[PDB]
Amino acid sequence: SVSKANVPKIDVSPLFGDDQAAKMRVAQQIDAASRDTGFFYAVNHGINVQRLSQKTKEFHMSITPEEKWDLAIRAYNKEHQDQVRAGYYLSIPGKKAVESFCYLNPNFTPDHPRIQAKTPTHEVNVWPDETKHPGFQDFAEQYYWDVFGLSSALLKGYALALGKEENFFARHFKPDDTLASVVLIRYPYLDPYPEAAIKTAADGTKLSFEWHEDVSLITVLYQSNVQNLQVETAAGYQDIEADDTGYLINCGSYMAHLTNNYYKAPIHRVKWVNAERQSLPFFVNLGYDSVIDPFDPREPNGKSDREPLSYGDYLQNGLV
Ligand SMILES: CC(C)[C@@H](NC(=O)[C@H](CS)NC(=O)CCC[C@H](N)C(=O)O)C(=O)O
Ligand SMILES: [Fe+3]
Predict the structure, then answer these.
(1) Which range of residues forms the domain containing residue 228?
(2) 31: Cβ below 6 Å to ligand 1?
(3) Where isopenicillin N is bound, by residue?
(4) What burial class does residue 222 get, using C-beta atoms within 10 Å of its C-beta: 0-12 exposed, 13-18 middle, 19+ buried?
(5) Residue tagged active-site, from 139, 177, 214, 257
(6) Which ligand does the CA of 270 lie closest to?
């Protein structure tokens, strides 16, 4: 069978407070996990994940085909040319099992200067009808800000881990401008299950999502309690155990760039499981113009031979 990945449970609650030595001890655990498999579970995070799962289920199970077309991104609906990121990503019965809903910063309103300028990667969110989904928009926008707050705390820990002051990343992660997204992904139970929605890895593992690195600074993930993720290590792909009380955290390729691959973006994949489940990532993205000068925490002088890359350039290139 497959070996279990080392994915430690880190109590992140000190990152919300003012005990600086305790925060350093959290930062050390973040450093160790980031140098090993690249994954950890954040525990004691303060977010009501059971209610997130309930509200998400109520949405996924009640939205109708009509509503999905009305909310669809341009890949599924040619009438919606402004929807590249935000909206509904449809299933294709018989072919594509997964479906999802993506939303961006609630502050990206019609009057927001980056919306007025039509800057790439910025869009105004689309929402289902309030009478059909009562409370959903409000819940979802509040969730954005709850996970934003957890992510800001995690970014203080990553900064400390790397020998930086605790606002080194967080100062670029701001409510008025962050490019961060929430995706509410439904993986369905299907009988029979479409073979076209099952991919096969070179090692024979049946997959729902092939190997990749994340397009993010960090990724902050809730999943149901159905084991599915695997991480590539030197010892091969290893199983990430599920924990539906925690958030699974990893670095994305912008972190790898800034740190000269000291904190790698781990390669991971999703196993095929015929189970009704949820995958609810928050992609921690900075602002469009944010630039962090690359560095290397393994070199006496910290210098890297990588060129500065704005987050907007990174994101537009990555989302293709
Ligand atoms: C591994 C999970 C995080 C999940 N997959 C995913 O979320 C995958 C790979 S990280 N996500 C993406 O490709 C990027 C979505 C970006 C989003 N539309 C945005 O505009 O910001 C899954 O369960 O398949
Ligand atoms: Fe991923």
Answers:
(1) 1-320
(2) no
(3) 85, 89, 181, 187, 279
(4) buried
(5) 214
(6) 1
